[PDB]
Amino acid sequence: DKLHSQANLMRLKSDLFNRSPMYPGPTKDDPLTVTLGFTLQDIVKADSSTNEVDLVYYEQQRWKLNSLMWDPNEYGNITDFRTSAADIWTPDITAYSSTRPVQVLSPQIAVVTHDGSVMFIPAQRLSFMCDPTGVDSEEGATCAVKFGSWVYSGFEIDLKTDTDQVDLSSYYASSKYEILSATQTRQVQHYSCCPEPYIDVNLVVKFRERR
Amino acid sequence: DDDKLHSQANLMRLKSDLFNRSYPGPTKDDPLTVTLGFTLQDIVKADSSTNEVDLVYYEQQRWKLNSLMWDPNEYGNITDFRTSAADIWTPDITAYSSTRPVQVLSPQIAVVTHDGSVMFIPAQRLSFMCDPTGVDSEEGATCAVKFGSWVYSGFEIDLKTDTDQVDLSSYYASSKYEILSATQTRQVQHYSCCPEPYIDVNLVVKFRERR
Amino acid sequence: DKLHSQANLMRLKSDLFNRSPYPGPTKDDPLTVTLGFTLQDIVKADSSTNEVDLVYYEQQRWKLNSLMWDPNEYGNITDFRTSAADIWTPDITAYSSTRPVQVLSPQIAVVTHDGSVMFIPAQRLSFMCDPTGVDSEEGATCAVKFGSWVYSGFEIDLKTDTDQVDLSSYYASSKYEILSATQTRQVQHYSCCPEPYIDVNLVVKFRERR
Amino acid sequence: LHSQANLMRLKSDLFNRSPYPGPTKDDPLTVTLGFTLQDIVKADSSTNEVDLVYYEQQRWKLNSLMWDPNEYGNITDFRTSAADIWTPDITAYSSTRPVQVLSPQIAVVTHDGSVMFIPAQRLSFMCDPTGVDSEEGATCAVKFGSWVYSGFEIDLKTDTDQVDLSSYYASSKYEILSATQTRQVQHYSCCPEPYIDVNLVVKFRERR
Amino acid sequence: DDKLHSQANLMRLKSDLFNRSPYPGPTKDDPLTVTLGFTLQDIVKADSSTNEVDLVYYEQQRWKLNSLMWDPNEYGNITDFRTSAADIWTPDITAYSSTRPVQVLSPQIAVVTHDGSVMFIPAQRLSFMCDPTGVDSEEGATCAVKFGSWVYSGFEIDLKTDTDQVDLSSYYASSKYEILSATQTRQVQHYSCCPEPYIDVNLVVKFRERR
Ligand SMILES: COCC[C@H]1C[C@@H]1c1cncc(OC[C@@H]2CCN2)c1
Ligand SMILES: COCC[C@H]1C[C@@H]1c1cncc(OC[C@@H]2CCN2)c1
Ligand SMILES: COCC[C@H]1C[C@@H]1c1cncc(OC[C@@H]2CCN2)c1
């Protein structure tokens, strides 16, 4: 019973990976939209001697490829599967003002659904450039970090968020810092030199010491 | 001498018949129960400037796969074997509020038995979010961390405990912290990414400065 | 449509990586590498060990005949992105780091049909630097050289497009403000050897933002 | 000087052409262990961790590693990467960080099938150094044994119960008053069979 | 524009040399001479609370294998080439009193000449055992660390130097510590048990705080 559904996975993965492409990333002819959302878990540390703040968050990434589509009927009605994030193409989304390599906190496993969409939610600790003056005041501190593609312009990779409100429903209730607000905003930058636009998601967090 | 080279051939054979001839993980059609217990060894450090605590513990994981069964009679009466944890599927049990990558302290080897059950007991050091306020009081501090599949919902991986008492038999007797109580309890929850409920085992520890 | 433009890229890459007879520069085939620095932040200055930590991007550019193609053969593709591991890259090294350099950005190169490669890794580097005077008006001064580790000026030459370090994305709220930053090609002669070595020297003058 | 070709053939015969799946109940293994303490680098009294630098001498013997030297131009032993052969999963039971390796990981295999493997390491382990700043010093223990094999598959022995102190760093912050290594038979709550360790007990104090 | 033939020759040479098959390292019947020299760049730290000192230096290693020889006439007059150090045998030269794993500061690439000689110069940071007592006086502190093969006696690896003077021509002029002297001395020792000679190079450095 269970054997057969396992052999259909094996054929599906073989068709998709071994007998096919492999996907060389997006182009201007075939652009890709990548949806980003943040779930801020903690501001672990705000260092006023080096102006670095450390955040822990889950970063949800979603995109869709024609090359990852299948008909569930040809594969015993399997509609999705888990795969190592290293066994598929993934987007090169990066913080633009990190000061330390990102530390990955969760397994590197993505889920592929039959419509060709991919879900990947890496949990991470990020140090990034930020001046925390005002954390010990009523109004608090403000920090900002952009995320986007390192090498693709808005012509190959478009970014989007589902909402501009950072998910705060798992924010650690006993953090050294209380969150005043956290937004995530798609921003487009144009240059008079260059025909191609650049997209980033801007993460802005205002916070203060838990009084 | 004769019998020894014999059962070595039998073991090598079995291991060949099991791996080189075929498990892609659980699915809604073929779900898996994993049992989780914790053995707490030491609360090493409590940092109240960042609210992080560092624990050393091991984590007993047990599950059972039909594809890992054999009749001992076909294999020179072999009933179990040790194998590297990279040779088989293992569950993606993740701490949900770690602040740094988990550090592995023990060899990554599991023990497989003829009934297809697997026993895997990695020892680890983990930093996680924990306000240690009260730790210098009779009543002490209370902190909690949850452990669950990152990418499989309760439809795919069920988690259970064998007892809800954390094993204290190896708790370091001269730790800076003594343990008032430690419990491990199954919980459920939705996450904003996903409709399905996800299972976790919540580890709650009340601890106090020794003496 | 999608079928074809994508299949062309796949074919172009297959042709370059699976099908071509580049093992690095030789004396009979030297390479010039253009280097440019963008300084993002001076993170830390430790006057107890004389180490300073910089976050910066390092723009590297070179050009190879073996990466040329005619776009007309490949559906008018003019360039592509690829993993830096798929291609030869040069061993440009800081000569006075005190810790392994930490890579902050993806490792991905852009390759153009004229065969030119561009590669811009962001990095955090701890290097040898006495920050004495960082708390005064005149500021502190430090220097670090970058060049190939194993290739002499007969195999790898370096140039800069400019001697001014790009300060246009320097972190405005850094602990340290930049007084000036220059990048200058140098040649060193030796410690025996007829063949010289080439580096790009980065000189940064800085002080506490007060 | 056909000895190079001979060593390549030997290694090729043992490793490439042959498959040792580790010890079993029907084929148990005895590992001899001995410790050489090089330096107590650090003692942290705010966390109760102590950092030791030491060698862990490991020796065992396999039939599947025997050869006749005469068949191989009289080669009696050779060195090879530890990753080419099976090695025992000897683990400290009370480390607080991953063990860091200080030396190459190269084993010496001898024609009788005996293997000697002596890696150098730095270990942080659980230890209260209270009394380190007094005449009688502090005492701490850490045991080492197979993580996943019981006494029925891996047994341990020592050649002496004296930890070798003859390379101990003479200008260390701490001096050693004693250091012993002793085989133990233990039953853990996890598991029904006995597991063997060697227990290293070290008494030490601040130098002068 | 027949750089192409020079490239073809280089690729053909590397393939003939490597994409061959069986060097098992040295033996008593086949000893290898290895020449060692240090270029001391900086004493970065001297920790008198743990008696560890950290140095940054270049370690030059030279040896020669018959199996790496070729006739340049056969390979478009190529007389040397660069290659990843992972592609060749390298000697197991080690600090005998380090307290942390060495950190590699430079690419790991060797230069191979047609007479079979290899030149390999890794830059490194080393923590080693060292009492920095008197660093704050005119006489200074002294520390010493031996380097040698981990598993090979002087009958298999003959370790040599070209000079006993450490190269200080690159020493950091603004270091916290100024170098009074730095020597590298080959020593040949015999022991109780064993008939084999053992060779080490003793690096002795005398240093003091910059005035
Ligand atoms: C089944 O369709 C929804 C896709 C979600 C399964 C994939 C997923 C991937 N990575 C992380 C996920 O997180 C679920 C909970 C939140 C942390 N673990 C879910
Ligand atoms: C005298 O030796 C001749 C061969 C040298 C080319 C090979 C070499 C290998 N690795 C590092 C090298 O350093 C050159 C300069 C010093 C740092 N860059 C040279
Ligand atoms: C109920 O479990 C019995 C099976 C045990 C063999 C498997 C095992 C796996 N991993 C670690 C083990 O630890 C035994 C001792 C405690 C630390 N080493 C045992």
Automatic annotation (TrEMBL), chain B:
Disulfide bonds: 130-143, 193-194
Entry binding sites for Mg(2+) 2: 80, 156
Sequence positions that bind Mg(2+) 5: 156, 196
GO MF term list: extracellular ligand-gated monoatomic ion channel activity; identical protein binding; metal ion binding; transmembrane signaling receptor activity
Residues engaged in binding Mg(2+) 4: 153, 156
Keywords attached to this entry: Calcium, Metal-binding, Receptor, Signal
Residue positions with a glycan: 77
Residues that hold Mg(2+) 6 according to the record: 190
Binding residues for Mg(2+) 3: 80, 196
Binding-site positions, Ca(2+): 169
One GO CC annotation: membrane
Descriptive protein name: Soluble acetylcholine receptor
Lineage: Eukaryota, Metazoa, Spiralia, Lophotrochozoa, Mollusca
UniProtKB/TrEMBL annotation, chain E:
Residues the record lists as binding Ca(2+): 169
Keyword Transmembrane in record: no
GO cellular component: membrane
Ligand binding (Mg(2+) 4): 153, 156
Chain residues that bind Mg(2+) 6: 190
The entry's keywords: Calcium, Metal-binding, Receptor, Signal
Family annotation (Pfam families): Neur_chan_LBD (PF02931)
Residues involved in Mn(2+) binding: 5
Binding site for Mg(2+) 2: 80, 156
Binding-site positions, Mg(2+) 1: 5
Disulfide feature: 130-143, 193-194
Keyword Calcium in annotation: yes
Residues with attached carbohydrate: 77
One function term, GO molecular function aspect: transmembrane signaling receptor activity
Residue span(s) of domain Neurotransmitter-gated ion-channel ligand-binding: 22-208
Binding site for Mg(2+) 3: 80, 196
Positions annotated to bind Mg(2+) 5: 156, 196
PANTHER family assigned to the protein according to its UniProt record, in alphabetical order: NEUROTRANSMITTER GATED ION CHANNEL
Protein name per Swiss-Prot or TrEMBL: Soluble acetylcholine receptor
Organism the protein comes from: Aplysia californica (California sea hare)
